Structures are given as C-alpha cells and as structure tokens.
Design an enzyme around this catalytic site. Structure first.
Site, PDB file in Angstrom:
ATOM      1  N   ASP A   1      -5.753   2.633  15.400  1.00 15.91           N
ATOM      2  CA  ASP A   1      -7.031   3.334  15.470  1.00 15.91           C
ATOM      3  C   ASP A   1      -8.128   2.388  15.962  1.00 15.91           C
ATOM      4  O   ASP A   1      -8.982   2.780  16.761  1.00 15.91           O
ATOM      5  CB  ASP A   1      -7.427   3.903  14.100  1.00 15.91           C
ATOM      6  CG  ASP A   1      -6.425   4.915  13.560  1.00 15.91           C
ATOM      7  OD1 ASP A   1      -5.645   5.502  14.346  1.00 15.91           O
ATOM      8  OD2 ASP A   1      -6.435   5.140  12.331  1.00 15.91           O
TER       9      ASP A   1
ATOM     10  N   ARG B   1       0.833  -1.195   0.000  1.00 17.79           N
ATOM     11  CA  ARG B   1       0.000   0.000   0.000  1.00 17.79           C
ATOM     12  C   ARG B   1       0.869   1.247   0.000  1.00 17.79           C
ATOM     13  O   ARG B   1       1.757   1.402   0.840  1.00 17.79           O
ATOM     14  CB  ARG B   1      -0.926   0.039   1.222  1.00 17.79           C
ATOM     15  CG  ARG B   1      -2.211  -0.759   1.080  1.00 17.79           C
ATOM     16  CD  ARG B   1      -1.924  -2.240   1.019  1.00 17.79           C
ATOM     17  NE  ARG B   1      -1.165  -2.678   2.186  1.00 17.79           N
ATOM     18  CZ  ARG B   1      -0.619  -3.882   2.309  1.00 17.79           C
ATOM     19  NH1 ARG B   1      -0.749  -4.771   1.334  1.00 17.79           N
ATOM     20  NH2 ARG B   1       0.060  -4.195   3.404  1.00 17.79           N
TER      21      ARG B   1
HETATM   22  N1  LIG Z   1      -2.736  13.857  10.577  1.00 15.40           N
HETATM   23  C1  LIG Z   1      -3.780  13.071  10.305  1.00 15.40           C
HETATM   24  N2  LIG Z   1      -4.978  13.388  10.837  1.00 15.40           N
HETATM   25  C2  LIG Z   1      -6.028  12.609  10.556  1.00 15.40           C
HETATM   26  N3  LIG Z   1      -6.091  11.515   9.802  1.00 15.40           N
HETATM   27  C3  LIG Z   1      -4.884  11.222   9.290  1.00 15.40           C
HETATM   28  C4  LIG Z   1      -3.710  11.926   9.489  1.00 15.40           C
HETATM   29  N4  LIG Z   1      -2.660  11.328   8.805  1.00 15.40           N
HETATM   30  C5  LIG Z   1      -3.214  10.293   8.219  1.00 15.40           C
HETATM   31  N5  LIG Z   1      -4.558  10.167   8.469  1.00 15.40           N
HETATM   32  C6  LIG Z   1      -5.478   9.137   7.977  1.00 15.40           C
HETATM   33  O1  LIG Z   1      -5.498   8.080   8.924  1.00 15.40           O
HETATM   34  C7  LIG Z   1      -5.009   6.858   8.311  1.00 15.40           C
HETATM   35  C8  LIG Z   1      -4.139   6.120   9.305  1.00 15.40           C
HETATM   36  O2  LIG Z   1      -4.844   5.920  10.527  1.00 15.40           O
HETATM   37  C9  LIG Z   1      -4.280   7.311   7.057  1.00 15.40           C
HETATM   38  O3  LIG Z   1      -4.288   6.294   6.060  1.00 15.40           O
HETATM   39  C10 LIG Z   1      -5.083   8.531   6.626  1.00 15.40           C
HETATM   40  O4  LIG Z   1      -6.218   8.210   5.844  1.00 15.40           O
END
Ligand SMILES: Nc1ncnc2c1ncn2[C@@H]1O[C@H](CO)[C@@H](O)[C@H]1O
Ligand SMILES: [Cl-]
Ligand SMILES: [Mg+2]
Length: 346
Positions: free
Chosen positions: A301, A127
C-alpha cells in the site's frame, strides 16, 4: 484546503492495534500469524478489544495508500477518498481520524451496518488479524461524486472495490477517460480478485493507464488471460503481455504502464510511450537491516502511495518506483499503517 491531486475509492477499515495474551487468541479461536475474516462468534472481539485501549488507525488498502499521498503532499485536502462506513460509533471514530490527518473524505453511510474493522492482535512478535468488512460491501458512488473530486487528475481504485460492485471502479475509470490529462490507476489487490473478476477486469484494464500488482497477482493474471517471475526474462514477458490488456495493441498516446513489485527482487515495469514503443524499466529495492523490519503489512500500500505522490509531482517512472520503494521501506519499521511528518522520504 486542496487542491486535491489524487482521488481514490476503497473499502475503509478501522484498525485496532493491541498486545494481547495468548489466551485472548484462543478464546476467539484465532491462529497466531493468520489473517482472516470474522466468523459470527468472533464478532464480539471488537467491543472486547476496545477495553485494551487499542491504537486506532485508519486502515484498508486504498485508504492506506492515499494517506501516504496526503502525508507526502503535506497540504490539507491534497488527497480525496470515498468508501462506505456504518452509522455506528466506529464510523465516526474513523472519520475523525481521517480529518485529523488532513485527508478529504466522503463516506457513504449504510444505516444499520457496522463500519469495517480489523483487530490487529500483537502476540509473540507476530500479528494476527481478524477483519469484519461490514458496510464496505454496500458502497455505491453518489451521483455527484465528481464534484468532490474537484480538479484531481490522478484516480486510483483497488480491485478490492470490485466486491461491492465493479460499477464504482468502472465509473471512476470512465470519468478519467473523458479527461485527456487524467489517468486511472488500478491495483490487482489479490490473486482471487484476478480470478473472480476476469470479465470485469478485461473491460476495466482497457480503461486503465497504470496497473499495479505483485508477483502472484500478475502470475494469475497471465494464466487467466493467457498472457504467456523470480526470473527476470519471465517477469518481463508477463509485464509485456499484461500491457496488452491496457493497450489492445493500439497506441492512444496516453499513459500505459504495468508495474510489478517482486518482494526483494527489483521492480519490473513495462511501458508504452506516446511514441508507441515498449520500454522495460528495472529498479532495485534498497534493503534495510533485518533488525529493523518490524511489520511488512502495508508495504504494498505504501509503495503505491509513494508512486502516486511522485507521479503527481511529474517524476519519471523510475523515480516514482524509487519513491514507492522508499515508502514501503519506511512503513515496515513499525506495526500498523502510519507515518510521521518527520524524515519523510521522496
Ligand atoms: N478487502 C479489503 N479492502 C480494504 N481494506 C482491506 C481489505 N482487506 C484488508 N484490508 C485492510 O488493509 C490492510 C492491509 O493493507 C489490512 O490489515 C486491513 O486493515
Ligand atoms: Cl481497499
Ligand atoms: Mg484520461
């Protein structure tokens, strides 16, 4: 609709997933396997990708976590979320996707700016991500955000929100502090958030009940704040020291807990009961056959989402960690952050 049990703020991102030929990566100067922010020329990738009929999914750390909460709570409007999007087409697509999942959302619209978007490019079983944060950085809580939060007693923010302004997380934590039965939870999000926002975090952590983070994040926190990880005794030392950033050595009797995920190794957590004594928790992580691990992106997450869900159900710290582990284990078996209603864990 509701009741809303968990409320979170974050940077909302629309993820666009698609298999692409290697020539696609080269045209946009992307290195397979890397995750980066879009450069000016790479901005054309998004409309170009739309032609591949990509799978569109809500994204962004905090948003992924509350989607897990919403999924597990089942009933529509059980989790709420606020963030900034643009007044572009992608913004409406993201809102609709969130509505479809039953998540309660209130997106601040930043006219003339683009909604956060991430190209999730699948190539050779890897990815490659290219993200454009856009409107996320202009987010500012509306004066009546607390009305949207209803009777929620669990508040969450990612350190990533500090980028727009630490004031949003400070305001959420301040509101939660004024409610005895409410708690504020925070994610360290990334080692650089820990470094860049040393001062802001110092203050914010004193208004935090539960702190989430992984090894590298806590390691930098320990160095930045001089608190002192594959080694248990050391991980415990780090967690115990970090707990001081939440308690200041005092006992408010409120929830005070630091949770450290450590990849494959057991989760370690340090807690200070209303009693005033420190307790160390250790929970092993159930492994899955290497043949099922498809995409590790979003594991953290999912862990937080599962932990918050279990917390809303009144489970013990260990049970919350176990639920988080189960969710992380579930999401890594498919690319993109999504879950099905069938066979949900916890
Ligand atoms: N600074 C950020 N704040 C919020 N979402 C993010 C950020 N950086 C990446 N992401 C999203 O969260 C995913 C990883 O949890 C990434 O693939 C992207 O879609
Ligand atoms: Cl986020
Ligand atoms: Mg409180």
């Amino acid at each position: 609709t509701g009741p809303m049990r968990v409320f979170a703020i974050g940077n909302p991102i629309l993820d666009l997933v698609a298999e692409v030929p290697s020539s696609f990566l080269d045209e946009f100067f992307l290195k397979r396997g890397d995750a980066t922010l879009a450069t000016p020329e790479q901005m054309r990738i998004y409309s170009t990708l739309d032609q591949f009929n990509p799978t569109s999914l809500p994204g962004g750390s905090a948003l992924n976590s509350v989607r897990v909460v919403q999924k597990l709570l089942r009933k529509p409007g059980s989790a709420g979320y606020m963030g900034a999007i643009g007044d572009d087409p992608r913004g409406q697509v993201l809102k609709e996707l969130c509505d479809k999942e039953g998540l309660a959302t209130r997106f601040m619209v930043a006219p003339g700016q683009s909604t956060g978007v991430c190209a999730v490019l699948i190539n050779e079983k890897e990815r490659t991500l290219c993200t454009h944060l856009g409107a996320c950085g202009s987010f500012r809580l509306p004066e009546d955000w607390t009305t949207f939060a209803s009777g929620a007693l669990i508040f969450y923010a990612t350190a990533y929100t500090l980028t727009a302004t630490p004031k949003n997380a400070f305001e959420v934590a301040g509101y939660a502090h004024g409610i005895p039965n409410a708690i504020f939870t925070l994610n360290l999000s990334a080692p650089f958030c820990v470094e860049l926002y040393k001062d802001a975090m110092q203050s914010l952590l004193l208004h935090t009940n539960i702190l989430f983070g992984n090894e590298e994040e806590f390691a930098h926190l320990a160095k930045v704040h001089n608190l002192v990880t594959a080694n248990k005794e050391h991980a415990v030392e780090v967690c115990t020291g970090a707990l001081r950033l939440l308690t200041a050595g005092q006992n408010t009797g409120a929830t005070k807990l630091v949770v450290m995920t450590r990849g494959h190794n057991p989760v370690i957590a340090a807690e200070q009961t209303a009693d005033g004594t420190v307790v160390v928790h250790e929970v092993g992580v159930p492994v899955v056959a290497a043949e099922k691990i498809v995409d590790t992106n979003g594991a953290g997450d999912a862990f937080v989402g599962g932990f918050l869900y279990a917390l809303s159900q009144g489970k013990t710290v260990k049970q919350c960690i176990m639920c988080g582990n189960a969710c992380a284990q579930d999401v890594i078996q498919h690319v993109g952050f999504s879950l099905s209603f069938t066979s949900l864990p916890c």
